[PDB]
Design an enzyme around this catalytic site. Structure first.
Site, PDB file in Angstrom:
ATOM      1  N   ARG A 168       0.834  -1.198   0.000  1.00 17.48           N
ATOM      2  CA  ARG A 168       0.000   0.000   0.000  1.00 17.48           C
ATOM      3  C   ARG A 168       0.871   1.251   0.000  1.00 17.48           C
ATOM      4  O   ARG A 168       1.126   1.833   1.056  1.00 17.48           O
ATOM      5  CB  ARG A 168      -0.937   0.004   1.209  1.00 17.48           C
ATOM      6  N   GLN A 175      -7.841  -2.759  23.789  1.00 17.68           N
ATOM      7  CA  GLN A 175      -8.339  -1.564  24.452  1.00 17.68           C
ATOM      8  C   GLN A 175      -7.188  -0.778  25.074  1.00 17.68           C
ATOM      9  O   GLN A 175      -7.073   0.433  24.873  1.00 17.68           O
ATOM     10  CB  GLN A 175      -9.376  -1.930  25.517  1.00 17.68           C
ATOM     11  CG  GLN A 175     -10.077  -0.734  26.138  1.00 17.68           C
ATOM     12  CD  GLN A 175     -11.055  -1.123  27.232  1.00 17.68           C
ATOM     13  OE1 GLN A 175     -11.029  -2.248  27.738  1.00 17.68           O
ATOM     14  NE2 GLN A 175     -11.925  -0.190  27.602  1.00 17.68           N
ATOM     15  N   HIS A 194      -5.711   2.871  23.283  1.00 15.14           N
ATOM     16  CA  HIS A 194      -6.119   4.057  24.029  1.00 15.14           C
ATOM     17  C   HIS A 194      -4.942   4.963  24.375  1.00 15.14           C
ATOM     18  O   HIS A 194      -5.092   5.919  25.134  1.00 15.14           O
ATOM     19  CB  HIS A 194      -6.869   3.660  25.301  1.00 15.14           C
ATOM     20  CG  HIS A 194      -8.314   3.344  25.069  1.00 15.14           C
ATOM     21  ND1 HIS A 194      -9.273   3.476  26.050  1.00 15.14           N
ATOM     22  CD2 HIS A 194      -8.963   2.912  23.962  1.00 15.14           C
ATOM     23  CE1 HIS A 194     -10.451   3.133  25.557  1.00 15.14           C
ATOM     24  NE2 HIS A 194     -10.290   2.787  24.292  1.00 15.14           N
ATOM     25  N   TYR A 196      -3.405 -15.379   9.147  1.00 12.25           N
ATOM     26  CA  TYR A 196      -2.449 -15.853   8.153  1.00 12.25           C
ATOM     27  C   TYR A 196      -1.627 -17.007   8.707  1.00 12.25           C
ATOM     28  O   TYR A 196      -1.415 -17.101   9.917  1.00 12.25           O
ATOM     29  CB  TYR A 196      -1.506 -14.730   7.709  1.00 12.25           C
ATOM     30  CG  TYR A 196      -2.172 -13.533   7.065  1.00 12.25           C
ATOM     31  CD1 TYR A 196      -3.485 -13.591   6.616  1.00 12.25           C
ATOM     32  CD2 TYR A 196      -1.477 -12.340   6.903  1.00 12.25           C
ATOM     33  CE1 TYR A 196      -4.088 -12.496   6.029  1.00 12.25           C
ATOM     34  CE2 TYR A 196      -2.071 -11.240   6.316  1.00 12.25           C
ATOM     35  CZ  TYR A 196      -3.376 -11.322   5.881  1.00 12.25           C
ATOM     36  OH  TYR A 196      -3.969 -10.227   5.295  1.00 12.25           O
ATOM     37  N   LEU A 216     -13.380   2.965  13.344  1.00  9.80           N
ATOM     38  CA  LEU A 216     -13.426   1.547  13.002  1.00  9.80           C
ATOM     39  C   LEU A 216     -12.957   0.671  14.165  1.00  9.80           C
ATOM     40  O   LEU A 216     -13.270  -0.523  14.214  1.00  9.80           O
ATOM     41  CB  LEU A 216     -12.592   1.266  11.742  1.00  9.80           C
ATOM     42  CG  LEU A 216     -11.064   1.393  11.746  1.00  9.80           C
ATOM     43  CD1 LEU A 216     -10.389   0.089  12.153  1.00  9.80           C
ATOM     44  CD2 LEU A 216     -10.565   1.847  10.379  1.00  9.80           C
ATOM     45  N   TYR A 217     -12.221   1.264  15.102  1.00 11.27           N
ATOM     46  CA  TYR A 217     -11.681   0.518  16.232  1.00 11.27           C
ATOM     47  C   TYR A 217     -12.641   0.458  17.420  1.00 11.27           C
ATOM     48  O   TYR A 217     -12.270   0.008  18.504  1.00 11.27           O
ATOM     49  CB  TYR A 217     -10.345   1.115  16.682  1.00 11.27           C
ATOM     50  CG  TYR A 217      -9.222   0.106  16.693  1.00 11.27           C
ATOM     51  CD1 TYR A 217      -8.183   0.182  15.771  1.00 11.27           C
ATOM     52  CD2 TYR A 217      -9.211  -0.937  17.609  1.00 11.27           C
ATOM     53  CE1 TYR A 217      -7.155  -0.739  15.777  1.00 11.27           C
ATOM     54  CE2 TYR A 217      -8.190  -1.863  17.623  1.00 11.27           C
ATOM     55  CZ  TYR A 217      -7.165  -1.763  16.704  1.00 11.27           C
ATOM     56  OH  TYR A 217      -6.149  -2.693  16.711  1.00 11.27           O
ATOM     57  N   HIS A 257     -16.809  -2.711  20.253  1.00 10.79           N
ATOM     58  CA  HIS A 257     -17.710  -3.043  21.353  1.00 10.79           C
ATOM     59  C   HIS A 257     -18.198  -4.504  21.369  1.00 10.79           C
ATOM     60  O   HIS A 257     -18.290  -5.096  22.444  1.00 10.79           O
ATOM     61  CB  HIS A 257     -18.913  -2.100  21.332  1.00 10.79           C
ATOM     62  CG  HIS A 257     -18.536  -0.653  21.285  1.00 10.79           C
ATOM     63  ND1 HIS A 257     -19.208   0.268  20.510  1.00 10.79           N
ATOM     64  CD2 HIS A 257     -17.551   0.031  21.913  1.00 10.79           C
ATOM     65  CE1 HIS A 257     -18.653   1.457  20.664  1.00 10.79           C
ATOM     66  NE2 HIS A 257     -17.645   1.340  21.510  1.00 10.79           N
ATOM     67  N   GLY A 310      -8.261  -0.932   8.329  1.00  7.86           N
ATOM     68  CA  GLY A 310      -7.524  -1.046   9.574  1.00  7.86           C
ATOM     69  C   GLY A 310      -6.045  -1.346   9.407  1.00  7.86           C
ATOM     70  O   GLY A 310      -5.203  -0.736  10.066  1.00  7.86           O
ATOM     71  N   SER A 317      -2.876   0.806  10.880  1.00  9.64           N
ATOM     72  CA  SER A 317      -2.099   0.170  11.938  1.00  9.64           C
ATOM     73  C   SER A 317      -0.612   0.142  11.615  1.00  9.64           C
ATOM     74  O   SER A 317       0.209   0.610  12.400  1.00  9.64           O
ATOM     75  CB  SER A 317      -2.596  -1.253  12.190  1.00  9.64           C
ATOM     76  OG  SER A 317      -3.903  -1.240  12.733  1.00  9.64           O
TER      77      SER A 317
HETATM   78  C1  COH Z   1     -10.626  -1.517  20.791  1.00 15.01           C
HETATM   79  C2  COH Z   1     -11.391  -2.199  21.650  1.00 15.01           C
HETATM   80  C3  COH Z   1     -12.300  -1.496  22.689  1.00 15.01           C
HETATM   81  C4  COH Z   1     -12.818  -2.120  23.749  1.00 15.01           C
HETATM   82  C5  COH Z   1     -12.591  -3.602  24.128  1.00 15.01           C
HETATM   83  C6  COH Z   1     -13.611  -1.172  24.500  1.00 15.01           C
HETATM   84  C7  COH Z   1     -14.297  -1.442  25.667  1.00 15.01           C
HETATM   85  C8  COH Z   1     -15.010  -0.537  26.429  1.00 15.01           C
HETATM   86  C9  COH Z   1     -15.503  -0.761  27.777  1.00 15.01           C
HETATM   87  C10 COH Z   1     -15.261  -2.088  28.548  1.00 15.01           C
HETATM   88  C11 COH Z   1     -15.541  -2.285  29.842  1.00 15.01           C
HETATM   89  C12 COH Z   1     -16.142   0.359  28.164  1.00 15.01           C
HETATM   90  C13 COH Z   1     -16.854   0.656  29.504  1.00 15.01           C
HETATM   91  C14 COH Z   1     -16.078   1.308  27.070  1.00 15.01           C
HETATM   92  C15 COH Z   1     -16.618   2.578  27.066  1.00 15.01           C
HETATM   93  C16 COH Z   1     -16.182   3.624  26.280  1.00 15.01           C
HETATM   94  N1  COH Z   1     -15.377   3.507  25.165  1.00 15.01           N
HETATM   95 CO1  COH Z   1     -14.491   1.769  24.466  1.00 15.01          CO
HETATM   96  N2  COH Z   1     -13.557   0.039  23.836  1.00 15.01           N
HETATM   97  C17 COH Z   1     -12.763  -0.113  22.713  1.00 15.01           C
HETATM   98  C18 COH Z   1     -12.485   0.898  21.806  1.00 15.01           C
HETATM   99  C19 COH Z   1     -12.773   2.248  21.948  1.00 15.01           C
HETATM  100  C20 COH Z   1     -12.241   3.309  21.116  1.00 15.01           C
HETATM  101  C21 COH Z   1     -11.271   3.144  19.927  1.00 15.01           C
HETATM  102  C22 COH Z   1     -12.848   4.609  21.667  1.00 15.01           C
HETATM  103  C23 COH Z   1     -12.645   6.065  21.185  1.00 15.01           C
HETATM  104  C24 COH Z   1     -11.352   6.616  21.779  1.00 15.01           C
HETATM  105  C25 COH Z   1     -11.494   8.072  22.155  1.00 15.01           C
HETATM  106  O1  COH Z   1     -11.674   8.942  21.256  1.00 15.01           O
HETATM  107  O2  COH Z   1     -11.412   8.366  23.377  1.00 15.01           O
HETATM  108  C26 COH Z   1     -13.681   4.203  22.774  1.00 15.01           C
HETATM  109  C27 COH Z   1     -14.417   5.081  23.552  1.00 15.01           C
HETATM  110  C28 COH Z   1     -15.169   4.775  24.666  1.00 15.01           C
HETATM  111  C29 COH Z   1     -15.882   5.726  25.501  1.00 15.01           C
HETATM  112  C30 COH Z   1     -15.861   7.258  25.234  1.00 15.01           C
HETATM  113  C31 COH Z   1     -17.219   7.947  25.361  1.00 15.01           C
HETATM  114  C32 COH Z   1     -17.663   8.526  24.043  1.00 15.01           C
HETATM  115  O3  COH Z   1     -18.212   9.661  24.044  1.00 15.01           O
HETATM  116  O4  COH Z   1     -17.466   7.861  22.993  1.00 15.01           O
HETATM  117  C33 COH Z   1     -16.488   5.025  26.481  1.00 15.01           C
HETATM  118  C34 COH Z   1     -17.370   5.529  27.648  1.00 15.01           C
HETATM  119  N3  COH Z   1     -13.609   2.818  22.903  1.00 15.01           N
HETATM  120  N4  COH Z   1     -15.380   0.730  26.030  1.00 15.01           N
END
Ligand code: COH
Ligand code: COH
Ligand SMILES: *[C@@H]1O[C@H](CO)[C@@H](O[C@@H]2O[C@H](CO)[C@@H](O[C@H]3O[C@H](CO)[C@@H](O)[C@H](O)[C@@H]3O)[C@H](O)[C@H]2NC(C)=O)[C@H](O)[C@H]1NC(C)=O
Ligand SMILES: *[C@@H]1O[C@H](CO)[C@@H](O[C@@H]2O[C@H](CO)[C@@H](O)[C@H](O)[C@H]2NC(C)=O)[C@H](O)[C@H]1NC(C)=O
Ligand code: BOG
Ligand code: NAG
Ligand code: NAG
Ligand code: NAG
Ligand code: NAG
EC number: 1.14.99.1
Lengths: 551, 551
Positions: B89, B172, B176, B324, B353-354, B357, B495, B499
């Site tokens: 790419r 996560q 973050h 893979y 895209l990340y 949830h 993605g 990445s």
């Molecule tokens: C990649 C995997 C992943 C997982 C497993 C996960 C698991 C969980 C989790 C587990 C107990 C909880 C309580 C939350 C709750 C939240 N996540 Co995520 N999140 C994930 C990726 C993301 C990403 C990416 C963002 C946006 C980042 C940012 O801009 O702060 C996010 C943002 C949030 C927000 C920001 C609030 C808003 O206004 O969007 C909350 C609340 N969350 N998430």
């Protein structure tokens, strides 16, 4: 003390302590190996046998006029050569940057903190027995003695290349957008977080300052009209912070991007010229895009002016400095199929070598008047009295001083010159010869070899004792200049790579930016590609006076 | 309205208004020409006939295990294949970056302001007749209705790729550090000014925060010992601001680099592991360099841990995601002869895209307990009661949820999923199909082609009417996944470039940094090049439990 104080690693090998008394050299991709990276590989032996000296290449480019006049008119051949110029030393500058004043080793702090000037060479460790490492005396000679003996101007020495005050003030105005020392922190710190040509000296370093300088109509900058002439707005009108002595009337407190440009009228000249150019381009863009709003008009005008600046610096400014018969060319496309990093970090040593104090004259000759430094500083009445046209015509005629050669620093800026020496030591600069080796130059073996002369060499010898502890900045000013040239070898071989990196490394030279669309179309694009110091003055200075960087 | 609202320019053509009702496409270096950049050049017509589909290339990589067995065993072939992957790419990602939420045209404000997420596609113009441009209804369907019909989890759908909770929490925790949305300013703004893998989620975004977390002895971070186990220090001790509900006891208010990591014990597990790893590396380096001071030990450990992260993310994390048989390799030397930009800017769409949830399970199964979301949140006592060893053993066994395929978002995070839709609309994201064309994918012709299914497709058809106005984020979650995979085509094709750009674009991957001396010598260098998710846990978790990203 630190085991790397003596700088044992050669050929850009990296030194690392492996104990209190032992070091190790990292010879990775140096082309050398061994304890000190001094044993060349066979591939390296070949390359060194065929590498022409900087003096030889400079001879070819500064001779064979008739030949170059033919080359300069064959587009394919000109582009090909300019391509070689841009790539003939691909890894001189660290990019991404490495060391700074507080980090003689690589770290995330050194990389990520934009408040630092980067460093071409790491600082001498704090616990070293001598200032330069292990060589020389316990203390460097008094900077006052160095200044008075080989730096201060006796009789004025004019530049043999014929540089004028238009060039000198352009140099000051242009470089002070990325040379903005944060004296609240120290000489190793900068306020220019953009680290390049962003024209913050026109539009302001921060968004807050930019918005106070903008008209928010037609994408233009705020301005005032004095006697039918367009000048920058006042501090009182914009609430823009400027540095002025208290005795300056509020109507003479012009407000521009750089807070210190009220210091000299020569800077306010270019500040006025560039402000006019911005608003001029807005008029052009508005005619091409009646549907555009204020914001896009302003931003596109900024990108175009950034393009104009790089265009001028390469094809007028550096062209004049080089003394080449070959016409340098601004063309980002020459680097599209090349390995090049479109990013830049301003080096502390780039700032230090650009302290071209000898360039300044004894008086500033405008029209019929000869203003002294005292009369000239912070006196923008002079600008309002004579006007831009007289300023350009006069500064085009008045010759500037020779930078190399020694003893040409005007007495007026005596303290500033001594500060350059003192702050270099404060920032723990390595010696002249270390910086020469760092830039693939042979170390000087004597002071007479450095100056090409006997009187100053003997002075320097009594002061420094060893040529290997001679300092970088004073050496740049007393170095034997190239034949009828303004600079010595060290100045050019250090200055040029720093400059082109700072120019081509700009994002507008990257393939996704270098499109007509980025600049509002073919019209805006052509403004960049046809820009010159002459057209800049012709378009924005009444009467369209002829100008140049030579007398 | 804006002439470019219909997105007429194809194949990375740039659109520009030329009047109130007219546009022009800039087909510079697109390989196309014509009014809409749709007529292909002859050379371009050749490349199109030969280019294998993303589905085809994925089939080759997920089959012929015997052929990939040979490749992975021979280092020459493994490096050769990985070299192709890293350069497949060329110009997918704009670097230097271009647009953001406020600028659908290139501007210096968009480039220089690090507080913005950059944008792969420019935002839809404000005055466009429809949310996606000109197609679709006056208003996008109600986001709650979209969420409840095709996104919300009915029954837990386990990932057929076998991803576990060690994976989900690593994702996560790791992401973050560069997904730190500045909600004060808006969804298009970030607090992660490093824009990549700087481990700020361990060391703090600011120098002030870092110095509060550091012990300033042996380069180590502050810590506390509870029950003979090493944990992060408290808020009270460090005066580090963390996000905790008022009822959380003083000793359970752990202080780490990222303010939000106290939210879930899964994040604190990794925060604790990485804290121990840093101090472990300090011990290694102190043994190697008795002469080093606290500052150099810290900075060098940080560089090593950055390298460990990239190493682990590529060879364990992305390796798992890919499915893979070819073993992905972390080796910066593979790009030394290529045209790669060692810089990165985090794209808003990469963040969007990340939002995985659906990865979250219905309960968090640790040892013999099954904790609900209510019980798990902000409850670090769970971490202390069970300990790190049991956490790793349990989370290794517990499978995560499928991201693609639809209807697998836990109702507990209902508001988060809906916010992802709403904020995408606030930031004026272009449609799914516009983003597919942007990444060289074929536009979906129907909702059934998108989901590979009929029920959700029919619900989406009624809600959106036009497939060309289907939104990016809901599509990624309902998209037909690859055979027995966790993701759909669109997730992978967008993605992966983001990445690898963020991973390899790191300064430590640059030739001047990728040396033994940068990391304290061959010993520190080896720590990086031998790092694995298994070795990370083995070195820092009592008993050395087996761990993996798959159950
Ligand atoms: C990649 C995997 C992943 C997982 C497993 C996960 C698991 C969980 C989790 C587990 C107990 C909880 C309580 C939350 C709750 C939240 N996540 Co995520 N999140 C994930 C990726 C993301 C990403 C990416 C963002 C946006 C980042 C940012 O801009 O702060 C996010 C943002 C949030 C927000 C920001 C609030 C808003 O206004 O969007 C909350 C609340 N969350 N998430
Ligand atoms: C390149 C040409 C050039 C010119 C024509 C020029 C003309 C003049 C001039 C004309 C009337 C005056 C009064 C000064 C005086 C000064 N110059 Co210059 N300087 C020049 C190059 C520089 C550079 C480069 C710096 C560093 C600026 C920074 O780091 O902020 C500098 C810094 C300074 C400082 C900062 C003090 C310090 O401690 O560093 C003063 C004062 N000076 N200079
Ligand atoms: C990066 O972009 C940010 C968003 O454009 C910007 O934040 C914005 O900053 C401006 C000026 O600092 C604020 O506007 C100000 O305008 C009035 C003038 O009438 C002031 O009196 C107000 O106090 C107000 O602060 C914006 O409010 C602010 N926007 C946001 C969302 O924070 C950053 O400053 C930019 N960063 C850099 C380094 O320039
Ligand atoms: C870049 O480095 C400078 C110097 O280390 C930092 O400035 C220091 O900031 C701290 C705040 O944590 C102050 O206590 C010091 O007084 C500052 N020192 C100086 C000399 O100004 C600066 O914060 C760093 N920049 C970033 C973004 O971290
Ligand atoms: C031609 C102008 C005199 C140049 C002689 C070089 C030696 C100058 O000598 C120094 O000059 C400084 C400024 O004049 C004074 O402040 C010092 O007291 C003086 O020692
Ligand atoms: C390397 O340099 C040191 C001086 O720092 C010198 O003593 C030593 O002999 C050199 N080693 C070699 C192999 O030249
Ligand atoms: C400033 O310049 C004017 C000429 O325009 C002159 O009359 C005046 O004396 C100067 N001011 C100083 C303090 O020298
Ligand atoms: C370009 O696209 C427009 C739709 O915006 C279409 O009407 C026009 O016919 C196209 N032109 C060409 C040459 O394909
Ligand atoms: C926190 O976890 C503990 C188990 O260690 C549990 O007993 C307690 O109820 C949890 N707290 C809440 C508020 O659910």
């Amino acid at each position: 003390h630190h085991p790397c104080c003596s700088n044992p690693c050669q050929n850009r090998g990296e030194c690392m302590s492996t104990g209190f008394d032992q070091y190790k050299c990292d010879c990775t991709r140096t082309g050398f190996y061994g304890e000190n990276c001094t044993t060349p590989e066979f591939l390296t032996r070949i390359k060194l046998l065929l590498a022409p000296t900087p003096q030889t290449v400079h001879y070819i480019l500064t001779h064979f006029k008739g030949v170059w006049n033919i080359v300069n008119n064959v587009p394919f051949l000109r582009s090909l050569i300019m391509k070689y110029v841009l790539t003939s030393r691909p890894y001189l500058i660290d990019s991404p940057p490495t060391y700074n004043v507080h980090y003689g080793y690589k770290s995330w702090e050194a990389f990520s903190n934009l408040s630092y000037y980067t460093r071409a060479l790491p600082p001498v460790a704090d616990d070293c027995p001598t200032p330069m490492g292990v060589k020389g005396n316990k203390e460097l000679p008094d900077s006052k003695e160095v200044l008075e003996k080989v730096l201060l101007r006796r009789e004025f020495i004019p530049d043999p290349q014929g540089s004028n005050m238009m060039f000198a003030f352009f140099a000051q105005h242009f470089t002070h957008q990325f040379f903005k020392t944060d004296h609240k922190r120290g000489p190793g710190f900068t306020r220019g977080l953009g680290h390049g040509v962003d024209l913050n000296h026109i539009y302001g370093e921060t968004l807050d300052r930019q918005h106070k300088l903008r008209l928010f109509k037609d994408g233009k900058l705020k301005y005032q009209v004095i006697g039918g002439e367009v000048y920058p707005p006042t501090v009182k009108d914009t609430q823009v912070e400027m540095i002025y002595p208290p005795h300056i009337p509020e109507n003479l407190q012009f407000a521009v991007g750089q807070e210190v440009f009220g210091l000299v009228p020569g800077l306010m000249m270019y500040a006025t010229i560039w402000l006019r150019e911005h608003n001029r381009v807005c008029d052009i863009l508005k005619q091409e895009h009646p549907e555009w709003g204020d914001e896009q008009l302003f931003q596109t005008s900024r990108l175009i002016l950034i393009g104009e600046t790089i265009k001028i610096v390469i094809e007028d400014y550096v062209q004049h400095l080089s003394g080449y018969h070959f016409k340098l060319k601004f063309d980002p496309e020459l680097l599209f199929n090349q390995q090049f990093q479109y990013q830049n970090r301003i080096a502390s040593e780039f700032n230090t070598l650009y302290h071209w104090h000898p360039l300044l004259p004894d008086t500033f000759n405008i029209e019929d008047q000869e203003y002294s430094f005292k009369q000239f500083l912070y006196n923008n009445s002079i600008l309002l009295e004579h006007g831009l046209t007289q300023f350009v015509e006069s500064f085009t005629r008045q010759i500037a001083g020779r930078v190399a050669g020694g003893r040409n620093v005007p007495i007026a800026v005596q303290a500033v010159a001594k500060a350059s020496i003192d702050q270099s030591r404060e920032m723990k600069y390595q010696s002249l010869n270390e910086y020469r080796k760092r830039f693939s130059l042979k170390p000087y073996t004597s002071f007479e070899e450095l100056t090409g002369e006997k009187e100053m060499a003997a002075e320097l010898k009594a002061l420094y004792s060893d040529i290997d502890v001679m300092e970088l900045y004073p050496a740049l000013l007393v170095e034997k200049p190239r034949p009828d040239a303004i600079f010595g070898e060290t100045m050019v071989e250090l200055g040029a790579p720093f400059s082109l990196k700072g120019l081509m490394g700009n994002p507008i030279c990257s393939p996704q930016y270098w499109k007509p669309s980025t600049f509002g179309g073919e019209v805006g694009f052509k403004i960049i590609n046809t820009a010159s110091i002459q057209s800049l003055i012709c378009n924005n200075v009444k009467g369209c006076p002829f100008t140049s960087f030579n007398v």
